[PDB]
Amino acid sequence: MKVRPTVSSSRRKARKAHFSAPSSVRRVIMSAPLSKELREKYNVRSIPIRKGDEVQIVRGAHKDKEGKVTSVYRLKYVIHVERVTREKATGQTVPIGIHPSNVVITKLHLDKDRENILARIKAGREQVAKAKGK
Amino acid sequence: SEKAGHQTSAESWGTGRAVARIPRVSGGGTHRAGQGAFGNMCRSGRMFAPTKIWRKWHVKINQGQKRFATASALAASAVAPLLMARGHQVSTVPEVPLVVDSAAVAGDAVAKTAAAYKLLKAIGAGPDVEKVKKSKKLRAGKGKMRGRRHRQRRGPLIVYSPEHDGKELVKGFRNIPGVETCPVDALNLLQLAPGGHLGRFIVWTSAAIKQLDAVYESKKGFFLPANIVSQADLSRLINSTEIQSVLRAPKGEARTKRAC
Amino acid sequence: HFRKHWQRRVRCHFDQPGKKVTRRLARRAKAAALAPRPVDKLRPIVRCPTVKYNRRTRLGRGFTLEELKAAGIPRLLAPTIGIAVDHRRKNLSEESLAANVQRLKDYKARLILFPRK
Amino acid sequence: RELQKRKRRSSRPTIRMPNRRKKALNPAGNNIIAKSWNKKETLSQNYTRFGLVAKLGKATGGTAPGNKALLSESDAVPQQQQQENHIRQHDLELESKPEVLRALEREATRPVEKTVRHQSEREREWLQRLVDKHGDDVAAMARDRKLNPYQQTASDIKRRLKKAGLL
RNA sequence: UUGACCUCGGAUCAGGUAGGAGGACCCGCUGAACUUAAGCAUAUCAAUAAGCGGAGGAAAAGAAACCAACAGGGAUUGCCCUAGUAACGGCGAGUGAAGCGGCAACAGCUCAAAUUUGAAAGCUGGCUUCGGCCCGCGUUGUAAUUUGGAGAGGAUGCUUUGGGCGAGGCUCCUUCUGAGUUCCCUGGAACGGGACGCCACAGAGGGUGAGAGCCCCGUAUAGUUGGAAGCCAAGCCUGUGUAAAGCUCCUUCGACGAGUCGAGUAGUUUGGGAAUGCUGCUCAAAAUGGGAGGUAAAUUUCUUCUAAAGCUAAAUACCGGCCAGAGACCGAUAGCGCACAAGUAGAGUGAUCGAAAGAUGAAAAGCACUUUGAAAAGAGGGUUAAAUAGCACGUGAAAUUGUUGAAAGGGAAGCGCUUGUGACCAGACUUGCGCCCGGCGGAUCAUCCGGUGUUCUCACCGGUGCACUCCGCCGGGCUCAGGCCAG
RNA sequence: GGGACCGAGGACCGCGCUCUGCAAGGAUGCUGGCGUAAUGGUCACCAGCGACCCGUCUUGAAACACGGACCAAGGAGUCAAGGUUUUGCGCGAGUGUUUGGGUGUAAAACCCGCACGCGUAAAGGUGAGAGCUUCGGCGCAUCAUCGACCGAUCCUGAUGUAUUCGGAUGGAUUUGAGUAGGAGCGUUAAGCCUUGGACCCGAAAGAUGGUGAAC
RNA sequence: CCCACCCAUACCCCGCCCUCAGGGUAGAAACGAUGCCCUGAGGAGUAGGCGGCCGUGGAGGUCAGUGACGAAGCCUAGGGCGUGAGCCCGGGUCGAACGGCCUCUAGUGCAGAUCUUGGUGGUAGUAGCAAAUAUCUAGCGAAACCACAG
RNA sequence: AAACUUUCAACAACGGAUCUCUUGGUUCUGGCAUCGAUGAAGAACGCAGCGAAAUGCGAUAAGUAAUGUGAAUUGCAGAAUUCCGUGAAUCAUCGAAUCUUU
Structure with missing residues (x-):
């Protein structure tokens, strides 16, 4: 149960905040879990998704498909994986919008800021591990 | 809202025209113009006996009854x-x-x-x-x-x-x-x-x-509180040597045979 | 007695527990500001005026200057160490003087005064 | 209402006010009360644990158990049993338990320095010149108009000499 | 002739300030009528609405010319009771307080009436190398001292101090912090069902292709990263001037607000003819004074305060401002007029008046292409789980209408009771048990053995075998019981 | 002797009799029929009999009048305050925590210091009479009647009295929202009354503040 | 004047419903003592009074309730229950929630108010070609009125 | 005979009730105090590739600077514009500026 008076359990306010969110808040919302191997390697559970990550889809009709994220459409709250596409009536191959919660990141697009994010998350998790151990 | 239903400028047409005597909205260039107002029977009107905040919401109970x-x-x-x-x-x-x-x-x-x-x-x-x-x-x-x-x-x-x-x-x-x-x-x-x-x-x-x-x-x-009944077991009260001894003989059975 | 427009002047009290919380938090703020000090000042015992309430006593506004002088508390130090002073009240009798003087020496017996620096 | 409708359709951000109160609800600092104040306890429970009185007035409601915070005559003289025309003005002469109480007594009872007030150079020169002509006759120094222009009384000059150590 | 002073002006001189908005709450001024009194005029409405002026986060009020008659209380404000009491009233309608008592909050002060007179000690500006220099204001009074439950001046002996840095702390924003996308089925999609787990100071809430604690954001708790401004503050530097302050004593003093009180009178207002208060006109004070009360008590005895100058936080109000959190509320004819282009479209010369209008699908995958033709239109064909979900889009009632099928009718139709005819639809008791042989297999059978849990004498397992007993299963045999309707 | 309609109940108990069982406190026995349909139902039509169009209002009654094109949705005795009667409940000569304080898992729940409101305070005889009884009687509540006391009223007018104050004894056709062994306080539910918009809709008006013109 | 016959909701006999009344029922019953069993009588009704029960929105508890293997809604020349308001099931459509029970709560039940809003008709393809958009024939096209019919 | 009228059933219309939903309203509660001659509230005109509405802004005109985050924006079209970077963004914060006519 929420205790802090600043938190709201209103369904109306939560839906308004979700569907009227800025682009950076949408970045934070559009997060994906890491793979098992990356979770043991970096000690990080989930990261906000970005273009250039290689993911595997674990839910939906396109399960077990892998590919590189070529677009992060924050407005439509969806990502566009490579070769996971469709066909229009005319025959054009349009991408299929997949929610980032339905994928698992198998390879990260490692830059300096992403390494900083991973280091901060790992430091917090290990400091809570120290707090739990003693 | 205190002003809900009746923040409208409407007047009654009287008996001059062959319409129901209800206050209707003035004006002549709107879909709203000519429609009735100020009534529980009217669309976009004030309801009957509007709810007020000075209803009795809380109930005072004696503390003795609450402890009971x-x-x-x-x-x-x-x-x-x-x-x-x-x-x-x-x-x-x-x-x-x-x-x-x-x-x-x-x-x-x-x-x-x-x-x-x-x-x-x-x-x-x-x-x-x-x-x-x-x-x-x-x-x-x-x-x-x-x-x-x-x-x-x-x-x-x-x-x-x-x-x-x-x-x-x-x-x-x-x-x-x-x-x-x-x-x-x-x-x-x-x-x-x-x-x-x-x-x-x-x-x-x-x-x-x-x-x-x-x-x-x-x-x-x-x-x-002290109960008004000491022994709440009614079968102990009725089916006891104390009462069964002074009881007169039964005047019938549980089921009465039809005579005629 | 509803002759006037009483609808525009109905005061409900749905904010009674919220105002109680506000009052308790104000007392907590007073405690935070005056950390070892009590949040209240010391007030004298006075007799209720009328004949109906003459038998009982209550708390007054502040101690008389004669009561403070008899208890050994100087007038200018008294408001700075938690005692209330009232220059309007007079003793008028040797029995209120003795009672409030006893109250003041009882307060003096249980006070921890700290040096200025 | 029209303003609130405007902000709902506006792209301008909603300026969120932080909950900044004017008065702090907990004591703070490096003093004794701050390190023993429980933020999850009320005023009465905290002052009970300290061993102090929170409210000096009459009790106004019921309290929790263990509150401890919400408190010959020759001449017929009612005050002669009360005894133990000038009094000390800037201080009082006051003559198992919880640890905060004992710490407060200890910090209130510890010895302090006094910072004894010295004398100016010109005052010392005046008192010196006054001694070099009369020696010890403080009455003659008071009578002297030349060396004592402000016609101070011999008692005041004797007190100033004693403070200077010139007797 | 020249120079002051005083008074009245000018300047596109220098430095400032006011106006408008908002106005829920607040302070003033002004001020109705309907209505009730079953008519109506006093009264009520109402010292309200409208109108005008002026502020703030609160405002106002406020440290007694007070309450009281007490064994006294002790600035103001607000809550509770006082109390529908006192009081006033076509004594009708009715109107309608306050002291005390309980509580919330508490805080006290600044001037004028004094000679600094052994020293205008005071202040606004301009110039600055920022350290101290000029002009001006002011003696028709700027500092210090004092403000009547006081005070001053001397004497007296004790007791008190002033500035500048400041580590660090509090408040508030911020960074980070638990656990399944394991297997099977259904399904377009698991967020559903079944199995096996895990986290929990976190099982609030939202999203994700359907009900997700463990997919994601957040949530709980202590911390932790960086920053902003206030306030507090351990300590560290310095202080100074015969400088300031409190108390005590007394062969010395002690100034307290005037066209204001008050009297007469006219309005207005109040529960209030000591006019309840206020205002206008006429007259116009006092100094052991003045105001207000108490009292039949022997004469106005007594009691209690100081008006005509001023400041001040808190408890109190709040339809407005910056936010935040909620509800036994409403759910698109409801809830604000407005869930959406809403004070919009539109109407009026104008003041003003003022709507209707939400929902494809999980995802546009929003119907390619072939073929009619001039259409906001079809037929094939395609997407989709579904197109009888096709931007006329969730579901899709009734009124009303068209196509097909059946029946009836032409000086009303419709209804109640009772058969008949035709068409269509349903489908009656869910239809069982007991004995006698033969074979087989289990047991509650064996005074067989071992183990487990127990309510400690009852249950449950494992292994033995069919002498007895009891259950079932299979093959034969027989009897009985069976629902409704007629004679 | 012929016919019609009916078969209620469900071990035994009873009255009886023509007594090896019967027609005696309510129907059984035998035979036959029933699943490509026993038996029902719905719609339409025909047929026999019956039948003034609904709501409101007036009148002794009618008769007039008012409203009704149809369908969907909406649509009218409510909520407060103050009295009063009754049912339930807690405590009871007392009762009421919730102005407020404390506390809390935080508009909840739990606790109560002084007040305050309302109420209470400031046993007699006889006769009936429920009930009980050792059979002798004891007698609830309540009623009738005879008595007792009091605020106050009518005289008679004590010891006394400060010397102008007081009421003792005996008498009255006295009263009272008086006494004569307390019943109230709080809450819940329902009904009624008064005032607020007051069950819903429906004038002419009047007042305040504005907008325009032009007789 | 005599005989036979016909039929009212009237009378008589039987069945069933309800109400009222009388009786029985505990070392407990072969049924919630707010239950069961036996017996008798009665049944019009405006204003009005009392009781029981059905339905709607929401709240607390419960049914270890139903549900994408299909909730709610809607349609239905289907099947039942109840005197009744109503309730339950079948068939079709549909696509995300809903129901019973015990209490609590209310903006809780419509045929009408020259009722409100929306939609839709006969008149009527009629009158007329009119503001908006002297005849016949194309195209356009109302209104009054309307309980049902002469 | 055919035509018309009435009733019933299936299908197709008209219409938008019912059900379910809700970035809306409404009522309560809590913290806080902030408009303007340094030009406010309000009114008008302009600024985008396609802008009809709404919103943002002012000739520095769907914005400039500074800080933070860290790889977009997005209906279509374009960029040799940026991806181990003082750096995208119809991003957030926000202390510096620009700020037409009234």
Whole structure:
């Protein structure tokens, strides 16, 4: 149960905040879990998704498909994986919008800021591990 | 709204025209113009007897009657057929006023939720907790739009002594769905008779029983009520040598044979 | 007695528990500001004026200058150490003087005064 | 209402006010009360644990158990039993338990320095010149108009000489 | 002739300030009528609405010319009771307080009436190298001292101090912090069902292709990263001038607000003719004074305060401002007029008046292409789980209408009771048990053995075998019981 | 002797009799029929009999009048305050925590210091009479009657009295919302009354503040 | 004047419903003593009074309730229950929630108010070609009125 | 005979009730105090590739600077514009500026 008076359990306010969110808040919302191997390697559970990550889809009709994220459409709250596409009536191959919660990141697009994010998350998790151990 | 329904500029057309005598909106270039107003019978009108905030929302109850009800609920909680008639799964519970030792819940022994779950499962309160977990259903009606989306049953009420057990056990029983915690000095009738139905399942501590002896002598202006009946067993009253001896012979049977 | 427009002047009290919480938090703020000090000032015992309430006593506004001088508390130090002073009240009798002087020496017996620096 | 409708359709951000109160609810600092103040306890329970009185007035409601914070005559003289025309003005002459109480007594009873006020160079020169002509006759120094222009009384000059150590 | 002073002006001189908005709450001024009194005029409405002026986060009020008659209380404000009491009234309608008592909050002060007179000690500006220099204001009074439950001046002996840095702390924003996408089925999609787990000071809430604690955001708890401004503050530097302050004593003093009180009179207002208060006109004070009360008590005895100058936080109000959190509220004819282009479209010369209008699908995958033709239109064909979900889009009632099938009718139709005819639809008792042989297999059978849990004498397993007993299963044999309707 | 309609109940108990069982406190026995349909139901039509168009209002009654094109949705004795009667409940000569304080898992629940409101305070005889009884009687509540006391009123007018104050004894056709062994306080539910928009809709008006013109 | 016959909701006999009344029922019953069993009588009704029961929105408790293997809604020349308001099931459509029971709560039940809003008709393809958009024939096209019919 | 009228059933219309939903209203509660001659509230005109509405802004005109985050925006079209970077963004914060006519 929420205790802090600043938190709201209103369904109306939560839906308004979700569907009227800025682009950076949408970045934070559009997060994906890491793979098992990356979770043991970096000690990080989930990261906000970005273009250039290689993911595997674990839910939906396109399960077990892998590919590189070529677009992060924050407005439509969806990502566009490579070769996971469709066909229009005319025959054009349009991408299929997949929610980032339905994928698992198998390879990260490692830059300096992403390494900083991973280091901060790992430091917090290990400091809570120290707090739990003693 | 105080002004809802009647923040309209409308006048009655009178008996000049062959229309109903209702105040209609003035103007001549709107869909609204010409429509009736100021009535519970009218669309976009003021309703009959608008609700006001100075309705009586709260009820004053005498403290003596509240203490009588709390004592009656406590007495009903010590009867196990009332516990199952209320809807509690206590068929594996060893004794109905389920007293556990305070050493199991003293300090930080139950302050973690896993330890509280283990204690509930060990003392026999497991099935009641699992009932609440499996009874989660979505609420029928518009209350889902108003912050009440789910409904579930009520599990065991933990009554403890905050002086002798501390308040760290409150944290360990908080996340377990259904189980509730209440100090022995501030018992709540809304929790002892949920829905107005008597016989709540209660796990006490030992210090809870000792201070339960203690705090009913500390209420000023209240003493534990004397019943108007000493022996509430009617079969003991009627089927006893005392009454059966002076009874005259029966004048008939339970079923009367038809004579003609 | 609803001859006037009483609808526009109905005062409900749905904010009674919220105002109680506000008052308790104000007392907590007073405690935070005056950390070892009590949040209240010392007030004298006075007799209720009328013949109906002459038998009982209550708390007054502040101690008389004669009461402070008889208790051994100087006038200018008294408001700075938690005692209330009232220059309007007079003793008028040797029995209120003795009672409030006893109250002041009882307060002096249980006071921990700290040096200025 | 029209303003609130405008902000709902506007792209301008909602300026969220932080919950900054004017008065702090907990004591702070490096003093004795701050390190023993429980933020999850009320005023009465905290002052009970300290061993101090929170409210000096008459009790206004019921309290919790263990509150401890909400408190010959030759001449017929009512005040002669009360005894133990000038009094000390800037201070009082006051003559198992909880640890905070004992710490407060200890810090209130510890010895302090005084910072004794010295004298100016010109005052010392004046008192010196006054001694070099009369020696010890403080009455003659008071009578002297030349060396004592402000016609100070011999008692004041004797007190100033004693403070200077010139007797 | 020249130079002051005083008074009245000018300047596109220098430095400032006011206006408008908002106005829920607040302070003033002004001020109705309907209505009730079953008519109506006093009264009520109402010292309200409208109108005008002026502020703030609160405002106002406020440290007694007070209450009281006490064994006294002790600035103001607000809550509770006082109390529908006192009082006033076509004594009708009715109107209608206050002291005391309980509580919330508490805080006290600044001037004028004094000679600094052994020293205008005071202040606004301009110039600055920022350290101290000029002009001006002011003696028709700027500092210090004092403010009547006081005070001053001397004497007296004790007791008190002033500035500048400041580690660090509090408040508030911020970074980070638990656990399944394991297996099977259904399904377009698992967030559903079944199995096995895990986290929980976190099972609030939201999203994700359907009900997700463990997919994601957040949530709980202590910390932790960086920053902003206030306030507090351990300590560390310095202080100074015969400088300031409190108390005590007394062969010395002690100034307290005037066209104001008050009297007469006219309005207005109040529960209030000591006019309840206020205002206008005429007259116009006092100094052991003045105001207000108490009292039949022997004469106005007594009691209690100081008006005509001023400041001040808190408790109190709040339809407005910056936010935040909620509800036994409403759910698109409801809830604000407005869930959406809403004070919009539109109407009026104008003041003003003022609507209707939400929902494809999980995802546009929003119908390619072939073929009629001039259409906001079809037929094939395609997407989709579904197109009888096709931006006329969730579901799709009734009124009303068209196509097909059946029946009836032409000086009303419709209804009640009772058969008949035609068409269509349903489908009656759910239809069982017991005995006697033969074979087989289990047991509650064996005074067989071993084990487990118990309410400690009852249950449950494992292994033995069919002498007895009891169950079933299979093959034969027989009897009985069976629902409704007629005679 | 012929016919019609009916078969209620469900071990035994009873009255009886023509007594090895019967027609005696309510129907059984035998035979036959029933699943490509026993028996029902719905719609339409025909047929026999019956039958003034609904709501409101007036009148002794009618008769007039008012409203009704149809369908969907909406649509009218409510909520407060103050009295009063009755049912339930707690405590009871007392009762009422919730102005407020404390506390809290935080508008909840739990606790109560002084007030305050309302109320209470400032046993007699005889006769009936429920009930009980050791059969002798004891007698509830309530009623009738005879008595007792008091605020106050009518005289008679004590010891006494400060010397102008007082009421003792005996008498009255006295009263009272008086006494004569307390019943109230709080709450819940229902009904009624008064005032607020007051069950819903429906004038002419009057007042305040504005907008325009032009007789 | 005599005989036979016809039929009212009237009388008589039987069945069934309800109400009222009388009786029985505990070392407990072969049925919630708020239950059951036996017996008798009675049944019009405006204003009005009392009781029981059905339905709607929401709240607390419970049914270890139903549900994408299909909730709610809607349609239905289907099947039942109840005196009745109503309730339950079948068939079709549909696509995300909903129901019973015990209490609580109310903006809780419509045929009408020259009722409000929306939609839709006969008149009527008629009158007329009119503001908006002297005849016949194309195209356009109302209104009054309307309980049902002469 | 055919035509018309009435009733019933299936299908197709008209219409938008019912059900379910809700970035809306409404009522309550809590913290806080902030418009303007340094030009406010309000009115008008302009600024985008396609802008009809709404919103943002002012000739520095769907914005400039500074800080933070860290890889977009997005209906279509374009960029040799940026991806181990003082750096995208119809991003957030916000202390510096620009700020037409009234």
